[PDB]
Write a protein that binds this ligand. Structure first.
Ligand SMILES: CCCCCCCCCCC(=O)OC[C@H](COP(=O)(O)OC[C@H](O)COP(=O)(O)OC[C@@H](COC(=O)CC)OC(=O)CCC)OC(=O)CCCCCCCC
Ligand SMILES: CCCCCCCCCCCCCCCCCC(=O)OC[C@H](COP(=O)(O)OCCN)OC(=O)CCCCCCCCCCCCC
Ligand code: HEM
Ligand code: HEM
Ligand code: HEM
Ligand SMILES: COc1c(O)c(C)c(C/C=C(\C)CC/C=C(\C)CC/C=C(/C)CC/C=C(/C)CC/C=C(\C)CCC=C(C)C)c(O)c1OC
Ligand SMILES: CCCCCCCCCCCCCCCCCC(=O)O[C@H](COC(=O)CCCCCC)COP(=O)(O)OCCN
Ligand SMILES: COC(=O)N(OC)c1ccccc1COc1ccn(-c2ccc(Cl)cc2)n1
Lengths: 75, 248, 54, 385, 93
């Protein structure tokens, strides 16, 4: 019946424009990679690029936008 | 350090016990102990909490006597020096799953799960970090991070990789009072129970501090009144000079 | 007025009245603060939860 | 005469508390010495009532302090008062010392009073360090390791001093049992130095904010300055109670609620807030022996000030240039604490080096040069030809 | 006991200052005046007057040291980002 309430608000704010200005930047990074460590000498790369920074940006905005509105609904 | 090696900042949730006049919600403590017994206690100990301290806080005396008797404790040896066992009593402490550190690491792929009696006070962030950890495991790790085999990603742990896997999921516990046992609901009640385990004087302390701050605040204002009265002669005293004759 | 030689003057019963009032003040001050605290947090306490789990 | 003047014991109370002549113009900054005396009584009394329940064995120590918190009646009041009472004791002392530096109280005829005070400060850092180690959490073990291993650099004699300090080959059980017995002792030595400190004040009495003589207008202590001191006693108790009962772990570190483990190092070993500026001075010196000398030299450069101030006026009240550089030195002392709580990384390495220089140049290069300039400006402004 | 080496302060009657002549002092009892009489005309007149004098000696130093902590903390966070990894390997060597 009731789903995880945090999962609902977490899912809602991913459909605002300071939500997708952070989703896309996180991804196209996730594209751009793929190739960026697929290729040759990868086990032999010196620095392989990742995406924790842009994930963190998305999950910082989303959390401190969802923090003051959750415990109103959790019993 | 980078932000990953530090960890993600925990947010500020609106806990019902935050405030100088607030108490713990004791129905959330009672529900929280049920989540501990049925989910956490398989691999975590609670060595610093005794059975008797639950009476009058989350459970009745008759309830706690029956929970303790379901465990066996070492008795003193018999008339011939052979060891005995006995059931639990109220003066006993809550037992843990493992007998030593080697058996704990063996059952968790080398890692050791910490005792939780003081985990709210022994971590930066407090209850906001414990809640955000349990509810923070993503679906996929972010593309690029290479986890070892046997580790799980969630960004609230420093480094990004933690030896614990997600253990909370919807409707695994059936609450006695009819609350929907969603993931967030159980996480909230767990953290509230654990904060009581660390600070069992929270409610008495906040009420004795109301008495002490009211008394000392009025003494401070009375002392300012009394001083300015006893100093009024010196503050308005006046001086006059008439140059004498330098005969002397 | 003549509060002086019953309230202010007689230091024998001043220090007496300081202490005699110190004991009475504590009893009523305690009861008043413990009633305000237990009422501000109504619905969280154990003695009320215990009644709801009947 | 009156009994309070004739009795052997009350005559000393009267001469120090009741009839003592005080300058009429002293302000509330002269009230800090009273508070430091109440602080020492708070710590000694709270500590003796906890020592009744404490065990110093390394296998029993952390759990004894948690036993004071849970099982002892009002034991959480004793510890939090005691732990936060040491943070307050150090804050009132820094303000007491900064006052004397501003109003010139170090100068003759009060050089002896300044020197007994520098001793009290050293013995007080030692006391607090020994007590934090007796908790035996994870900041307790690795803080004692870092400081005690510094003495292994003394030439030819160092590795004998560390093994005699430890009682073995590492921070272990003999180390924790000897640090508790010494930690009980040193407070009673501080009290004996506080009596010698007061004897040296009675000779010339106190100074005043104007820096001139106070023998032309004096007020007795009783019922002008006794009741002025109650004002600051109750403000001190109020703010302390607000930390003990409503925010009792904000002036600490969470790692010290983890029990001490030699096999797992913390990610950040950080002292309490009141030893951080001296911890940044140590880390700024690349060599180990020069670092431990420069850190202790930071406490004993205060003894050089009575000979480097070259002014004919006492105090800073009428001094424009010497006010600006007094407040440069204060905020440079706050940056050293911040840098002492950071990771060793660019640019916090060079910042702590330049700021360690400014700490030492104030006492040795700045004060002599501005004092001489100010003297000559007073002269040519009045005597002009 | 014997007398020790003397001071620059005495006691009541022989405090050790210069001889005074021609000064008169007047005073009134505190019981005959009203307390808490003007303490506005105090916090708004004198505190603001005392503040206005001694505030440029405290705030110009505070502004120099706080700016310094800023530009360092800003630069450090850049070094340990991914856009400042090339500079880190330059300055850390
Ligand atoms: C940790 C807790 C310890 C407890 C006590 C700490 C107190 C230390 C504060 C520093 C200090 O001692 O000097 C304060 C100084 C003013 O001293 P002054 O003699 O020149 O002015 C007498 C007044 O006009 C008459 O004050 P009056 O005697 O007429 O009324 C008393 C006053 C109470 O004020 C105090 O308690 C003083 C601490 O009543 C009120 O304020 C009514 C409002 C409820 O003010 C200044 O010059 C600048 C103050 C700002 C800088 C403070 C930063 C310190 C870190
Ligand atoms: C090893 C030992 C090293 C120790 C280093 C010491 C550093 C500890 C820091 C303690 C801070 C205390 C600073 C104030 C010093 C006390 C003396 C003083 O400042 O004099 C008060 C002065 C009075 O004003 P007047 O010049 O007019 O003289 C009186 C009138 N006849 O008026 C003033 O000067 C202004 C008073 C305002 C004080 C507040 C300014 C500082 C604010 C932030 C400080 C942060 C500290 C944590
Ligand atoms: C609701 C259930 C649980 C809660 C609230 C809980 C709580 C915690 C906490 C607070 C930590 C410490 C994280 C940190 O150090 O920052 C931890 C770590 C750990 N937990 Fe749990 N736990 C739960 C269930 C479990 C279960 C069921 C297991 C085993 C099957 C487990 C295994 C571990 C392990 C191995 C670690 C060590 C992490 C590491 O050091 O990398 N946990 N847990
Ligand atoms: C100048 C006086 C004193 C100072 C500045 C001082 C300082 C400290 C400090 C900083 C701690 C660690 C606080 C913490 O738990 O985080 C401590 C702990 C302790 N001190 Fe003291 N101390 C003083 C006097 C005494 C005396 C005289 C005794 C014994 C009679 C004592 C007994 C203890 C004990 C038993 C602990 C154990 C840990 C605790 O209970 O907090 N102290 N002290
Ligand atoms: C730690 C315990 C201490 C106690 C109980 C104490 C006590 C006192 C008292 C009651 C006074 C007279 C009132 C006053 O000027 O505020 C005083 C003055 C003084 N103290 Fe301390 N003090 C202590 C530490 C220190 C320290 C650490 C220093 C310097 C490093 C120091 C240096 C002075 C000086 C120079 C004066 C005279 C100030 C003047 O007359 O203008 N004292 N002390
Ligand atoms: C300028 O003029 C001043 C002045 O302004 C001030 C403020 C003072 C006031 C005082 C000081 C500045 C400091 C002096 C303080 C000391 C020497 C402190 C001694 C401290 C102690 C803590 C002694 C404690 C002894 C005990 C026996 C208590 C300990 C334990 C007990 C009672 C537990 C046992 C109980 C049972 C039931 C078994 C002056 O003396 C003074 O004159 C110069
Ligand atoms: C020891 C620390 C170093 C500093 C010196 C400490 C000084 C502070 C002492 C505090 C005051 C103590 C109050 C004393 C009360 C008056 C004493 C008295 O009446 O003297 C005696 C009687 O005293 C006694 O029998 C024993 C007193 C023991 C007190 C133990 C605390 C009265 O006799 P008399 O009238 O002749 O007065 C003495 C004249 N020199
Ligand atoms: C309150 O206790 C702590 O903060 N301790 O000590 C366990 C700690 C904890 C973590 C890291 C470092 C320290 C130590 O930091 C310092 C810096 C200087 N001293 C010192 C010590 C003795 C003497 Cl004589 C002179 C100077 N100690």
């Amino acid at each position: 019946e009731v789903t995880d309430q945090l999962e609902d608000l977490r899912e809602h704010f991913k459909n605002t424009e300071e939500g997708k200005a952070l989703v896309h930047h996180y991804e196209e990074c996730a594209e751009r990679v793929k190739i960026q460590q697929q290729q040759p000498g990868y086990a032999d790369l010196e620095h392989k690029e990742d995406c924790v920074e842009e994930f963190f940006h998305l999950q910082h905005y989303l959390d401190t936008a969802t923090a003051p509105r959750l415990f109103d609904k959790l019993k | 350090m980078t932000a990953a090696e530090h960890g993600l900042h925990a947010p500020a949730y609106a806990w019902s016990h935050n405030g100088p006049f607030e108490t713990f919600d004791h129905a959330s403590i009672r529900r929280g102990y049920q989540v501990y017994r049925e989910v956490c206690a398989a691999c975590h100990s609670l060595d610093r909490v005794a059975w008797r301290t639950l009476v009058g806080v989350s459970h009745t005396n008759e309830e706690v006597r029956n929970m303790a008797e379901e465990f066996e404790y070492d008795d003193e040896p018999d008339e011939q020096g052979n060891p005995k066992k006995r059931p639990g009593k109220l003066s006993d402490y809550i037992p843990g799953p493992y007998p030593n550190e080697q058996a704990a690491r063996a059952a968790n792929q080398g890692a050791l799960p910490p005792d939780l009696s003081l985990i709210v006070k022994a971590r930066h962030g407090g209850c906001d970090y414990i809640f955000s950890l349990l509810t923070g495991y993503p679906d996929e790790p972010p593309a690029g991070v290479a986890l070892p085999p046997g580790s799980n990603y969630n960004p609230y742990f420093p480094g990004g990789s933690i030896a614990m896997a997600r253990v909370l999921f919807d409707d695994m516990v059936e609450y006695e009072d009819g609350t929907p046992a969603t993931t967030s609901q159980m996480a909230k009640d767990v953290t509230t129970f654990l904060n009581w385990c660390a600070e069992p004087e929270h409610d008495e302390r906040k009420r004795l501090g109301l008495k002490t701050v009211i008394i000392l605040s009025s003494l401070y204002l009375l002392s300012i009144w009394v001083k300015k009265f006893k100093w009024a002669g010196i503050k308005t005293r006046k001086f006059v000079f008439n140059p004498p004759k330098p005969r002397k | 007025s003549s509060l002086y030689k019953t309230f202010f003057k007689r230091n024998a019963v001043f220090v007496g009245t300081i202490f005699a009032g110190a004991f009475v003040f504590q009893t009523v001050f305690d009861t008043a603060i413990t009633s305000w605290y237990e009422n501000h947090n109504k619905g969280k306490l154990w003695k009320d939860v215990k009644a709801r789990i009947a | 005469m009156a009994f309070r003047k004739s009795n052997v014991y009350l005559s000393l109370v009267n001469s120090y508390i009741i009839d003592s002549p005080q300058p009429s113009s002293i302000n509330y900054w002269w009230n800090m010495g009273s508070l430091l005396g109440l602080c020492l009584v708070i710590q000694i009394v709270t500590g003796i009532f906890m020592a009744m329940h404490y065990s110093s064995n390394i296998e029993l120590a952390f759990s004894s302090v948690e036993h004071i918190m849970r099982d002892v009646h009002n034991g959480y009041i004793l510890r939090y008062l005691h732990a936060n009472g040491a943070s307050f004791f150090f804050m009132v002392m820094f303000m007491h010392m900064a006052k004397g530096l501003y109003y010139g109280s170090y100068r003759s005829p009060r050089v002896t009073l300044w020197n007994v005070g520098v001793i009290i400060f050293i013995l007080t850092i030692a006391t607090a360090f020994l007590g934090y180690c007796c908790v035996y959490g994870q900041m307790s073990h690795w803080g004692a390791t870092v400081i005690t291993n510094l003495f292994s650099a003394i030439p030819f004699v160092g590795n004998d001093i560390v093994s005699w300090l430890w009682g073995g080959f590492s921070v272990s059980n003999p180390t924790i049992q000897r640090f508790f017995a010494l930690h009980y002792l040193v407070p009673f030595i501080i009290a004996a130095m506080v009596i010698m400190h007061l004897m040296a004040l009675h000779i010339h009495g106190s100074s005043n904010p104007l820096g001139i003589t106070g023998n032309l207008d004096r007020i007795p202590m009783h019922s002008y300055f006794i009741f002025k001191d109650l004002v600051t006693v109750f403000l001190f108790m109020l703010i302390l109670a607000l930390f003990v009962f409503y925010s009792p772990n904000t002036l600490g570190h969470p790692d010290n609620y983890i029990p001490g483990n030699p096999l797992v190092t913390p990610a950040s070993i950080v002292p309490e807030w009141y030893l951080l500026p001296f911890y940044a001075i140590l880390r700024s010196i690349p060599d180990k022996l020069l670092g431990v000398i420069t850190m202790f030299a930071a406490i004993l450069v205060l003894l050089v000030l009575p000979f480097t101030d070259r002014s004919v006026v006492r105090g800073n009240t009428f001094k424009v240039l010497s006010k600006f550089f007094f407040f440069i030195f204060v905020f440079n002392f706050v940056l050293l604490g911040q840098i002492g709580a950071c990771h060793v990384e660019v640019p916090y390495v060079l910042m702590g080096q330049i700021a360690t220089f400014i700490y030492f140049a104030y006492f040795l290069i700045i004060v002599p040069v501005i004092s001489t300039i100010e003297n000559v400006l007073f002269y040519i402004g009045r005597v002009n030809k | 006991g014997p007398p020790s080496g003397k001071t620059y302060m005495g006691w009541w009657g022989h405090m050790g200052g210069p001889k005074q002549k021609g000064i008169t002092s007047y005073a009134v009892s505190p019981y005959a005046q009203k307390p808490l009489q003007g303490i506005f005309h105090n916090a708004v007149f004198n505190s603001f007057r005392r503040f206005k004098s001694q505030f440029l000696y405290v705030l110009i130093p505070a502004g120099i040291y706080w700016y310094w902590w800023k530009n360092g903390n800003e630069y450090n966070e850049f070094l340990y980002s991914k856009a400042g990894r090339e500079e880190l390997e330059r300055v850390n060597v």
